[PDB]
Design an enzyme around this catalytic site. Structure first.
Site, PDB file in Angstrom:
ATOM      1  N   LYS B 225       1.633  -2.560  -0.770  1.00  0.00           N
ATOM      2  CA  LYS B 225       0.161  -2.452  -0.817  1.00  0.00           C
ATOM      3  C   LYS B 225      -0.275  -0.977  -0.987  1.00  0.00           C
ATOM      4  O   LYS B 225      -1.143  -0.676  -1.803  1.00  0.00           O
ATOM      5  CB  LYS B 225      -0.506  -3.094   0.406  1.00  0.00           C
ATOM      6  N   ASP B 226       0.370  -0.058  -0.252  1.00  0.00           N
ATOM      7  CA  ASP B 226       0.066   1.375  -0.364  1.00  0.00           C
ATOM      8  C   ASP B 226       0.449   1.966  -1.717  1.00  0.00           C
ATOM      9  O   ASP B 226      -0.253   2.832  -2.243  1.00  0.00           O
ATOM     10  CB  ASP B 226       0.742   2.174   0.750  1.00  0.00           C
TER      11      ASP B 226
END
Ligand code: HEM
Ligand code: HEM
Ligand SMILES: C[C@@]1(c2ccc(Oc3ccccc3)cc2)OC(=O)N(Nc2ccccc2)C1=O
Lengths: 109, 377, 47, 79
Positions: B225-226
């Site tokens: 996600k990051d």
């Protein structure tokens, strides 16, 4: 020290019931007490719940957190109905607040 | 082998690999790692610009042009720095907004450290902007510095002290280069302390309800996600650097030095607009700067004004409306801060200023109290 | 005033072209790994 | 910090799950997603949108007054 019913009380109820629907935690299957902010008084109240309630709240919260991640909601047929919404935590919480307040009044003298 | 035992990787593992995190944190939660990426971004490009910039009054404006014209790829490095400063603020804003909306400020220490991180980067960006010794760099440097002069009794010894003279001159450009180089390293330390306090409880989430029953490992999930979100920060940064290098950049810094001549309409960078409007609103020297300080220093009062029995605003229709009225009000302050101090604008600017404070100090807390009553809590 | 003008937009091209490849791809990497959570099913079975 | 194994007590919940290599990463991306965004949009417009049109209205008015008042102006000075 009693009698009254009012068309007005129903309006108040209607305003509450309206906000309850607007708040929307019932779309996630949550119940009011499931959404309370855990401060100390609250953690202790959670701690005092009997197994069944303690477990039910765990599953409801999981069900909601899981919905939140999918940004979904339950079918309308499954929303928690205002007025079928059980104040399960209240009495424990009130009691834990009472005892704390007692400790505090003793600490004053 | 093991990540868990090694005195060093144990920190890494406990911070980025096995850290239990809420299964449900949203995109709004991506900003903290983006703020880290921003800081590193500023650090690398910042540094390479330092290998070619010179801090003297004469050659300052010139060395920067040396970079943009002569030094290989200096232009791309210079623009990434400038546009990185804007992104950094874009991220601060979202990050601070996310904390307000979702009640995250209830983690006292980590929120308080955040405020410090906010002031530190604002201090940093200010010194930075002065560096090329352009017209706005100079006059902006003159405006902001003079705020300190409002402080009673010791006001002037202080500005002159910070100046190292009788006005923003030679001595100030050099010291600003110095402080602007060390600040981001000091920021970096505060951020690690920020992350330390946060791990003590772990992350909050959209619902404001504990996620200990549904934690997932930071690693595969938030790791990707990051990454995805970093690439988005990058696209947005490049778009600016590669298609709109001068868009947020005022045309007047492209003209050297004029301690003798103030531009007709000096305009702050962007991220200072709302605060500039607040300072300006009130026709008073002291009270303006006081209003200005309070406009930012208010974040640390936020936690005392929490009134609702719920943490997040996810189930709070009233607070939600007031939150956006706050955002809409800030956007108004921004518009107004970039406009001449005249007829329609000063009055709009004064009403928005009372609204900002009126809604934080009184409206929000009162909504919370009526939401509680509405719920029979 | 802006000598770099032409190189910048050639780079700029490449940035959108590359971004248009990587964005969908990295997005797909994340969905793959998040599959497991997105389709997970729960059941409560108390005594 | 806190570690898996020491978070909290959970009893009675079963979680069924599939291997990523066994499922799709975008199943009904449009079929179900579009409807979903429409629905989240409806759920929040009334709270998000209004303050912004309020700013929008003050934005256009405010600039309108500014132009007509100062510049455009020089209205009557008749002799
Ligand atoms: C590694 C620490 C940093 C160093 C060594 C550094 C170095 C520099 C140098 C040499 C300049 C003047 C050259 C130029 O203007 O292009 C500059 C300008 C600037 N930097 Fe930094 N900087 C650092 C951290 C930061 C931080 C934390 C910020 C805030 C995000 C920041 C935002 C700025 C800004 C706004 C300017 C003015 C840019 C302009 O329009 O020219 N830098 N920096
Ligand atoms: C150098 C500036 C900052 C950095 C590097 C930074 C970094 C981070 C990181 C990595 C997280 C972890 C998860 C997330 O993305 O939310 C986080 C969460 C948080 N930060 Fe910051 N942040 C910075 C500025 C701030 C500011 C300005 C505040 C508030 C004034 C703040 C208060 C918080 C809070 C309260 C959380 C709680 C997480 C939550 O509730 O969801 N930080 N930050
Ligand atoms: C970039 C800039 C700046 C940087 C950081 C700041 O810090 C704050 C940002 C928001 C709120 C409070 C302080 C403020 C201005 O530095 C600078 O010289 N200016 N220019 C300026 C123009 C007119 C008046 C005052 C300043 C900035 O915008």
């Amino acid at each position: 020290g009693r009698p009254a019913v009012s068309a007005s009380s129903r309006w108040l109820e209607g305003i509450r019931k309206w906000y309850y629907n607007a708040a929307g935690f019932n779309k996630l299957g949550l119940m009011r007490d499931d959404t309370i902010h855990e401060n100390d008084d609250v953690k202790e109240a959670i701690r005092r719940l009997p197994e069944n309630l303690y477990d039910d709240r765990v599953f409801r919260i999981k069900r909601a957190l899981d919905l939140s991640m999918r940004q979904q909601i339950l079918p309308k047929e499954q929303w928690t109905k205002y007025e079928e919404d059980k104040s399960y935590l209240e009495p424990y919480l009130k009691e834990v607040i009472r005892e704390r307040k007692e400790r505090e009044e003793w600490a004053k003298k | 082998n093991i990540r868990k035992s090694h005195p060093l990787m144990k920190i890494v593992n406990n911070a980025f690999i096995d850290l239990p995190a809420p299964s449900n944190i949203s995109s709004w939660w991506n900003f903290g790692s983006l703020l880290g990426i921003c800081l590193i971004l500023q650090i690398l490009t910042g540094l390479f610009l330092a290998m070619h910039y010179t801090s003297d009054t004469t050659t300052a404006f010139s060395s920067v042009t040396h970079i943009c014209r002569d030094v290989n790829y200096g232009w791309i490095i210079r623009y990434m720095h400038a546009n990185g400063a804007s992104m950094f603020f874009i991220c601060l804003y979202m990050h601070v907004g996310r904390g307000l909306y979702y009640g995250s400020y209830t983690f006292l220490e980590t929120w308080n450290i955040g405020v410090i991180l906010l002031l530190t980067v604002m201090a940093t960006a200010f010194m930075g902007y002065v560096l090329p010794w352009g017209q706005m760099s100079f006059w902006g440097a003159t405006v902001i510095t003079n705020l300190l002069s409002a402080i009673p009794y010791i006001g002037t010894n202080l500005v002159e002290w910070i100046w190292g003279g009788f006005s923003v001159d030679k001595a100030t450009l050099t010291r600003f280069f110095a402080f602007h180089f060390i600040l981001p390293f000091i920021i970096m330390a505060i951020a690690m302390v920020h992350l330390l306090f946060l791990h003590e409880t772990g992350s909050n989430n959209p619902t404001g309800i504990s996620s200990d029953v549904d934690k997932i490992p930071f690693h595969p999930y938030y790791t990707i996600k990051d990454i995805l979100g970093a690439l988005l920060l990058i696209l947005a940064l490049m778009l600016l650097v590669l298609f709109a290098p001068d868009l947020l950049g005022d045309p007047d810094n492209y003209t050297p030095a004029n301690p003798l001549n103030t531009p007709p309409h000096i305009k702050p960078e962007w991220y200072f607009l709302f605060a500039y409007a607040i300072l300006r609103s009130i026709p008073n020297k002291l009270g303006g700067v006081l209003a200005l300080a309070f406009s930012i220093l208010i974040l640390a009062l936020i936690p005392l004004l929490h009134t609702s029995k719920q943490r997040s605003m996810m189930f709070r229709p009233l607070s939600q409306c007031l939150f956006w009225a706050l955002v809409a009000d800030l956007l108004t302050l921004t518009w107004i801060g970039g406009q001449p101090v005249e007829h329609p604008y000063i009055t709009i600017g004064q009403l928005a200023s009372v609204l900002y404070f009126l809604l934080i100090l009184v409206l929000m807390p009162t909504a919370g109290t009526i939401e509680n009553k509405l719920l029979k809590w | 005033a802006e000598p770099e003008h032409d190189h910048r937009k050639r780079m700029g091209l490449k940035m959108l072209l590359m971004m248009g490849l990587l964005l969908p791809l990295v997005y797909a990497m994340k969905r793959h790994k998040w599959s497991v959570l997105k389709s997970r099913k729960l059941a409560y079975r108390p005594p | 910090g806190r570690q898996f194994g020491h978070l909290t007590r959970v009893r009675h919940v079963i979680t069924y799950s599939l291997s990523p290599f066994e499922q799709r990463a975008f199943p009904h991306y449009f079929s179900k997603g579009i409807p979903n965004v429409l629905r989240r949009t409806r759920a929040c417009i009334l709270r998000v949108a209004p303050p912004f049109v309020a700013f929008y209205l003050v934005y256009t008015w405010g600039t309108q007054e500014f132009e007509k008042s100062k510049r455009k102006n020089p209205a009557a000075y008749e002799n």
